Amino acid sequence: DALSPEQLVLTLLEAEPPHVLISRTEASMMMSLTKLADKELVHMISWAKKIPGFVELSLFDQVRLLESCWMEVLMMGLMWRSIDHPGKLIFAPDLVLDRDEGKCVEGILEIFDMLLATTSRFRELKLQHKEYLCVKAMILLNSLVTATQDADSSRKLAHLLNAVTDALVWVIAKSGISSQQQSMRLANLLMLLSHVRHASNKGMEHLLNMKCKNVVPVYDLLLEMLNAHVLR
Numbered sequence: 001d002a003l004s005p006e007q008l009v010l011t012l013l014e015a016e017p018p019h020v021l022i023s024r025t026e027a028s029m030m031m032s033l034t035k036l037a038d039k040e041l042v043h044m045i046s047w048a049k050k051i052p053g054f055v056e057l058s059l060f061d062q063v064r065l066l067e068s069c070w071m072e073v074l075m076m077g078l079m080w081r082s083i084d085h086p087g088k089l090i091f092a093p094d095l096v097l098d099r100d101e102g103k104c105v106e107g108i109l110e111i112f113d114m115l116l117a118t119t120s121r122f123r124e125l126k127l128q129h130k131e132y133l134c135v136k137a138m139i140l141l142n143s144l145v146t147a148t149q150d151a152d153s154s155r156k157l158a159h160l161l162n163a164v165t166d167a168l169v170w171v172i173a174k175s176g177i178s179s180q181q182q183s184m185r186l187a188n189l190l191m192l193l194s195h196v197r198h199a200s201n202k203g204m205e206h207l208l209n210m211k212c213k214n215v216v217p218v219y220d221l222l223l224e225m226l227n228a229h230v231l232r
């Protein structure tokens with residue numbers, strides 16, 4: 001009964017890690033970002049772990065879920081920090097970027113555009129903090145081929161996702177607005193998610209031709225952290 005709305009929303013509230021800090025030239029940027037990314041991915045795993053039922057899922061599912069959503073989760077987190085600061089992407093209190101500034105990294109601009117844009121749409125939608133938290137967990141749990149041995153784990157996963165989805169519904173209900181407005185809102189929140197998903201996809205295929213030269217691929221960084229903090 002811990003996967004009840006009120007409980008869950010509170011759990012996510014407390015499970016939220018504190019923003020990482022980082023003092024602030026093509027490569028030099030990738031440096032600071034990669035450095036932050038690594039620092040956030042660690043927190044992400046703790047965050048995941050603190051979600052009701054996650055560590056009870058099969059180890060396979062844990063790795064698969066985290067491997068498949070880190071980009072999107074990082075993106076969602078970026079936008080929320082930079083939701084109230086138009087034209088800017090607040091990677092960290094110190095490190096902040098301007099639209100034009102994005103022209104620095106090879107075509108990272110498209111990602112920047114898509115992001116800055118969607119951030120705006122969320123701002124307009126006046127995204128609430130609790131709405132944000134539920135939506136985030138959804139991404140972790142939602143983002144094909146199922147092995148017989150994984151059957152039970154799958155079954156559970158379905159529940160966690162349903163619960164979090166219900167919690168979001170609940171959070172929207174307490175917003176006070178009319179019933180049909182709740183419907184409309186939920187639909188909207190999900191529409192925008194599809195964008196973030198599309199953006200994070202671009203970002204991946206982007207790294208599928210990344211200048212691995214003066215930086216370390218975040219991939220390798222994650223695969224290592226997983227062996228460290230999820231297997232071991």
Ligand SMILES: CC[C@@H]1Cc2cc(O)ccc2C2=C1c1ccc(O)cc1C[C@H]2CC
Pocket residue numbers: 030033034035036037040071074075077078091108111112115203204206207210218
């Ligand atoms: C909007 C940048 C995106 C998401 C993000 C959020 C964050 O808080 C820290 C790092 C990142 C990275 C991204 C990204 C976007 C496109 C890529 O091909 C690779 C990456 C990896 C890192 C930047 C080192």
